[PDB]
Design a binder for this molecule. Sequence first.
Ligand code: FAD
Ligand code: FAD
Ligand code: TDL
Ligand code: TDL
Ligand code: MG
Ligand code: MG
Lengths: 605, 608
Amino acid sequence: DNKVKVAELVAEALENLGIQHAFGIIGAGNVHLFEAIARRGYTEIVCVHHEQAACMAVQTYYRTNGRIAAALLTTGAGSTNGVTGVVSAWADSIPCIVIAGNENSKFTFPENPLRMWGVQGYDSCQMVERVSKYQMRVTKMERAVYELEKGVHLALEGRPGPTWIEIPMDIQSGRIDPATLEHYVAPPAPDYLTPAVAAQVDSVLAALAKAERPVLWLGNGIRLAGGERLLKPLLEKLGSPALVSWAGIDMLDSSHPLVFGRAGVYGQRAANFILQNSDYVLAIGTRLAIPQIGYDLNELARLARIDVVDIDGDEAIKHAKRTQENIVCDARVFIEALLARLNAADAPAIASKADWVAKCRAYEEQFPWVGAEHADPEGFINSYRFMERLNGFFKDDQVVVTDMGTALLSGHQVLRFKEGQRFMTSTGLGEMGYGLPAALGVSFANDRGEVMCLNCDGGMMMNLQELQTMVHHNLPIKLFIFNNDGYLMIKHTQKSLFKSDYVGTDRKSGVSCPDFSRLAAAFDIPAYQIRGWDECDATLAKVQAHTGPVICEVFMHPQQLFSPKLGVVSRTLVSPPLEDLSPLIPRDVLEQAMIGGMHEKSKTL
Amino acid sequence: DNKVKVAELVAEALENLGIQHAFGIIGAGNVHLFEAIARRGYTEIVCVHHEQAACMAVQTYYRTNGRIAAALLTTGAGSTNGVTGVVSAWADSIPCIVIAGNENSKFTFPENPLRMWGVQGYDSCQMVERVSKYQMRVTKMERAVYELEKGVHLALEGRPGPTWIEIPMDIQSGRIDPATLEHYVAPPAPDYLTPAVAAQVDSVLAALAKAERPVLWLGNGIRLAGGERLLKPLLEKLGSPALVSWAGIDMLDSSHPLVFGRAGVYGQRAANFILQNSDYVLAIGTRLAIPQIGYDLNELARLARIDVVDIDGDEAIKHAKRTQENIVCDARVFIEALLARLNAADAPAIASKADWVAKCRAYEEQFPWVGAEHADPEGFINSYRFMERLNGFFKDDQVVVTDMGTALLSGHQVLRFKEGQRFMTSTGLGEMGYGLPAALGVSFANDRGEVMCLNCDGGMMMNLQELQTMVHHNLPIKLFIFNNDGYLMIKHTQKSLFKSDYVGTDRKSGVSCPDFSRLAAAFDIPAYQIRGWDECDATLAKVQAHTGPVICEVFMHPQQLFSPKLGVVSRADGTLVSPPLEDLSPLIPRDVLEQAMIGGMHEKSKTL
Ligand SMILES: Cc1cc2nc3c(=O)[nH]c(=O)nc-3n(C[C@H](O)[C@H](O)[C@H](O)COP(=O)(O)OP(=O)(O)OC[C@H]3O[C@@H](n4cnc5c(N)ncnc54)[C@H](O)[C@@H]3O)c2cc1C
Ligand SMILES: Cc1cc2nc3c(=O)[nH]c(=O)nc-3n(C[C@H](O)[C@H](O)[C@H](O)COP(=O)(O)OP(=O)(O)OC[C@H]3O[C@@H](n4cnc5c(N)ncnc54)[C@H](O)[C@@H]3O)c2cc1C
Ligand SMILES: Cc1ncc(C[n+]2c([C@@](C)(O)C(=O)O)sc(CCOP(=O)(O)OP(=O)(O)O)c2C)c(N)n1
Ligand SMILES: Cc1ncc(C[n+]2c([C@@](C)(O)C(=O)O)sc(CCOP(=O)(O)OP(=O)(O)O)c2C)c(N)n1
Ligand SMILES: [Mg+2]
Ligand SMILES: [Mg+2]
């Protein structure tokens, strides 16, 4: 008998695909796959306590060293519990593969008239049909490996994202002759550099050469394309300033002479003035999302031509009313072509941007990222200043992941990163409870390495249960929890709208959180507190020195403002242009800051 | 100048619909609805810490007192987080309504070529298309209330289920002349009792009058139809023994002289023998799911005719190869129709079933629910024996919810209930982490009332965050946690399949759980531990006496068997036989099985 169990061929296929880690929860629907994978000993199965955490962990796992991980979900609630993680990978263009079990294949077909399949199954492929790149239900044993190979390829192809492969129970346990396995062969990669795309590169170079105040907007699509190592030669060979999106912060040293921060709705004052006063904007590998460009294209860089580079055609033209050259090309290939034309013997002459570069620096001097607006309040540490202090304790290869809330905003508006350091979170979907699972994925991607997790009192609750996963594997995760009596981010929203008592956002309005230090002791986790500046530096040094997991509660003002921020101002109400962040600077100052004078909307504020 | 905010109209609608509780989490996508509901003060918003818990709590909220609740979710992950709750209410035919916000309506159209809508939005309606009864996105302000009234009616009509109404932000904050508000008029309620169905009731009454060994199988569909009070007079009038489905345990007093327990793959030995030796089976409001009838229809009640009553046409005929009368009718309407024909003048004479009833009681004397197979394993408390002991501490108005695992299996195989007591869980989907959200639903339904939650160390983790919601509202939830070093249910599964070391099921194999008494202290929750019989009664009396939340860890053997269980029997050379439904493991001696089966035992059981 030359037949082999399908589950064992699946485990073999995982090793040949380089998948060394799998996150998930066991159940009757995937018990065969757990056994075959565990007995083969190549892929380590990380058991979590909510499938949601499994489909989030696989994202930051890949982002760390570029190796895809698998989420291993069982029938029914095992598959539904993973859907949030699938969407956040879909929204952030992060490749991963879900392997979901299900009832016996005799029940699994859409035409089944009953509400549910078999005992507790459903059509998991239909549920993620609009939030994944590919879904398939293996119905023939001989195709199980075919679909896993295809599932992985489509996840990494083009615009990356999650794929969903469902293998019914009886397909896992069947037996076939290994020579009857079908294998998927990937088609040749597309050659983006066509004559058309070449003429677009030539147009960009022309504009770059002539532009007096250029600004490059660089995004995580460059890293997904594997070209972030070309950014230093490119910036210095152009001499042009550069902004980085929140997702692409770690692609360049925040202290590089030509990198001037991050702009947007929660941008940095210095970075917004840089973008809004430019005469040419080249977006590479950045989605130009609403939090990046505001709420009106006619107010975005009103003196500048805007070109875009993006591997997704639909994302590349979504601003075609405002943009000029919409380049559908891989970010790396595009940067190589642009460098190839800069290094050519017949390269055009690049006019000097020295005055512009000098004006950008002046912007950063007039508007420091942590400024007078961030003063401490009434017996509390200002979360922005704490981030500046905490920044001084990063290790040379530090990795930081954040949840939403204070950690997300204070983090991305302040923290600086060097080469070798990483910054990760989920911004496409922006879901609470992404922090802890994000740390798991990084830690396992670096052989149970260290990860700093900037979290919040609210977001900690969504996936609280993953503290047990953390202690179980003794993961060196340094977990900072910003306590502020509930949903501080929503507090500011409902106050701006209604200017009345809080509703469902603090302890008095129905939302409370536990004492996370008492909780840490229950999990055998060493806990600390930071309430003032006296014990700060000594506390930070001890947290960073621990070998295992640590919790460190950071208490802030229950109503601290998030600023700078592009908010609505009451003149009637007005939505100011991108440059006029709140709290509002004096008009005469803004007038001098704007090359062509302030926007009509600002004059009356 | 004479316009009202749409959100304020929605808040007004919820009061007119009698929705007094709404579970959810706030966010940009539904901040206007939170405001408007709270200002009006009619509907209490309960804030949970994972949207999944809001979509589970609305379920057991309804089943308690028959009042629907809302789930209030927000854009993006606020909606995706609730899907699991939607699917369990879909699988258990439990009504409820989800009101989910979303990005501005100019982004929310399926033709949008981008991966996501606006900032963080998606088509929340498409994602639940196949696991909910109705989904609609409100795109005109004037129909916002129309779709809520429609959603609540569709959730409650026919076979109840969840409905999903999505309202973009800008629709919530919009303002309209209230005169322009459209309202939903429900179509006329169907008349199930047509001449064709009336003829099927006659056929059933003919079979019941003639049958010598009849068995009624009563399910939660009866409760959902509002006809549970008709059961006691029906069984007594017919003199027919009756079984109850796991979900419908609390419809009849378990000690009623004609109620003989629960059958299935995890059924009681006596219940299975009663089912498999009958000559007529009348199933009313029960789905006859795989865990109830086994894996072969041809092996189910091999001496009986089987009739089925169910309001879902698709469920009523799914066993049509084997069943005879497939009656598509509301359960209460059917029972009322059968009671009218029973009490009529021309009602046929009901042949005596006294001998069958006696044989049903001999079965229960021969096979008690807690028997020798439930012996304490080597210095531990057997969960089945703990459930029997725990049963005697139930209050008169006790409500018991369970999670999966030991709480589910040992609870539904041992626990007995009387009128006034309720038993709830999620059996359709069978998701871990249902216990705590369930106890919230019941507690708020009964105005912060007391609830006993039978939970497990593994299942406690899926929604551990809801211990905070329990403390924040001082809900008198009595939380029992069965500790057994991980996923005991799965240990048996992989052991029967692979007969090797555990994988992903206990601490040694990658799955551990915290000390829940030490967490309890962290949440300011009193906690007890029951490791042996010696201190057991004194603890249980303490737990029941508490006025606020309490935790009690119950320690069992990390490899205790779950029995009786219809399970596979394996052989040395790789052979395995799936025995018939009556032949539950651990297998009883063949000579005793032969005498218990009327036509002798099944061929499969002879060589076992
Ligand atoms: C409350 C909030 C506030 C925010 N504020 C800001 C802010 O002030 N400033 C800011 O910059 N961001 C901000 N963000 C984040 C921002 O809105 C986006 O979520 C994202 O982080 C922008 O960075 P990105 O374009 O690199 O990421 P992504 O949105 O993931 O962009 C990746 C893009 O690259 C493309 N791509 C993928 N692979 C390739 C490839 N191989 N070749 C070429 N292109 C490829 C993708 O198609 C996509 O268009 C905020 C988010 C939130 C939730
Ligand atoms: C591991 C496991 C083991 C189990 N073991 C057993 C076991 O041994 N024995 C057992 O009995 N159960 C068992 N169950 C539960 C069983 O499989 C079902 O999930 C269910 O609990 C059986 O009860 P029910 O048919 O009343 O519930 P449901 O499945 O909810 O049945 C409701 C039915 O009534 C219909 N209905 C709804 N409203 C109306 C109305 N107004 N009028 C008429 N009909 C209506 C519905 O369409 C549906 O068909 C087990 C579950 C699990 C997860
Ligand atoms: C799962 C889930 N539920 C709700 C939300 C909505 N939501 C937010 C956003 C970013 O999505 C938003 O509305 O802008 S922000 C937010 C509050 C976060 O509170 P935390 O205590 O975690 O952080 P702080 O705001 O720093 O106190 C919530 C509930 C969300 N993002 N994810
Ligand atoms: C969310 C989720 N994830 C996985 C499962 C699978 N699953 C079960 C079933 C019932 O679905 C099954 O497969 O039969 S049972 C089960 C183990 C539950 O372990 P617990 O420690 O809670 O209970 P005991 O088994 O009594 O120890 C798991 C993981 C599940 N039910 N729900
Ligand atoms: Mg908070
Ligand atoms: Mg367990």
